[PDB]
Amino acid sequence: RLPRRPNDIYVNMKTDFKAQLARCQKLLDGGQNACSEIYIHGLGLAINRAINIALQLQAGSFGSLQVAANTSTVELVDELEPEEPLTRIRNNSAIHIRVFRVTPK
Amino acid sequence: GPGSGPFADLAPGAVHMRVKEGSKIRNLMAFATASMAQPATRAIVFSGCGRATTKTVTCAEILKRRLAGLHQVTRLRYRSVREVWQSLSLSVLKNVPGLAILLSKDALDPRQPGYQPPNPH
């Protein structure tokens, strides 16, 4: 159901912030193949990280990036015991943040 | 005292619920659903930061399931936290991510940043 474009990044909460920011930033800068926009997705406890990444990209862009967020609920499924089968089902809050190039002011 | 709330520009009459780490969802939602059950209440806001950001989103998402047809705007922001340091007194401030979410019965401008339309039942 969720999108899996090269544009869509589900951010890991565990990684170093500074490096993660720099990877996102490189997506927006290119090498070219620059993305005019990316989508930063944060699931559960990774919501603050997604926000922090987006707002920092915005802040360092000299007015050339803007951000906009939406929310949803995501269903995560995984097996505990094989098949009769015992499957763990979790609902998580999520945030979905568009980070896009604009004309400054 | 601290100014007008979030969304005072869009829905000044909305009830604002601050979501904190100490907040209890079922209890917070009980009040929110009762509030929004009334016809006089047209909208509600949930806000929070840091260790309550995820919980704030969950509260919004629960209400959207209990009342279908709500228009949503999400706004991102930072909020300060005081840290006292003496390690290698001294008050030091840092920004912590957060958000505020508006949910309303009445139509909102769909072109504004952070807008999300009502989910189909």
UniProtKB/Swiss-Prot annotation, chain A:
This is Ribonuclease P protein subunit p20. Component of nuclear RNase P and RNase MRP complexes. RNase P consists of a catalytic RNA moiety and 10 different protein chains; POP1, POP4, POP5, POP7, RPP14, RPP21, RPP25, RPP30, RPP38 and RPP40. Within the RNase P complex, POP1, POP7 and RPP25 form the 'finger' subcomplex, POP5, RPP14, RPP40 and homodimeric RPP30 form the 'palm' subcomplex, and RPP21, POP4 and RPP38 form the 'wrist' subcomplex. All subunits of the RNase P complex interact with the catalytic RNA. Several subunits of RNase P are also part of the RNase MRP complex. The keyword Cell inner membrane does not apply. Belongs to the histone-like Alba family. Component of ribonuclease P, a ribonucleoprotein complex that generates mature tRNA molecules by cleaving their 5'-ends. Also a component of the MRP ribonuclease complex, which cleaves pre-rRNA sequences. One of its GO terms (cellular component) is nucleus. GO terms for molecular function: ribonuclease P activity; ribonuclease P RNA binding; RNA binding. It is found in: Nucleus, Nucleolus; Cytoplasm; Cytoplasmic granule. Keywords: Cytoplasm, Nucleus, RNA-binding, rRNA processing, tRNA processing. It comes from Homo sapiens. It comes from the Eukaryota. The chain holds residues 29 to 140 of 140 of the full protein. One of its GO terms (biological process) is tRNA processing.
From Swiss-Prot, chain B:
The lineage of its organism: Eukaryota, Metazoa, Chordata, Craniata, Vertebrata. This is Ribonuclease P protein subunit p25. Belongs to the histone-like Alba family. The chain holds residues 22 to 157 of 199 of the full protein. GO terms for molecular function: ribonuclease P activity; ribonuclease P RNA binding; RNA binding. Keywords: Nucleus, Phosphoprotein, RNA-binding, rRNA processing, tRNA processing. GO terms for cellular component: centriolar satellite; multimeric ribonuclease P complex; nucleolus; nucleoplasm; ribonuclease MRP complex. Its main location: nucleus. Component of nuclear RNase P and RNase MRP ribonucleoproteins. RNase P consists of a catalytic RNA moiety and 10 different protein chains; POP1, POP4, POP5, POP7, RPP14, RPP21, RPP25, RPP30, RPP38 and RPP40. Within the RNase P complex, POP1, POP7 and RPP25 form the 'finger' subcomplex, POP5, RPP14, RPP40 and homodimeric RPP30 form the 'palm' subcomplex, and RPP21, POP4 and RPP38 form the 'wrist' subcomplex. All subunits of the RNase P complex interact with the catalytic RNA. Several subunits of RNase P are also part of the RNase MRP complex. It is found in: Nucleus, Nucleolus.
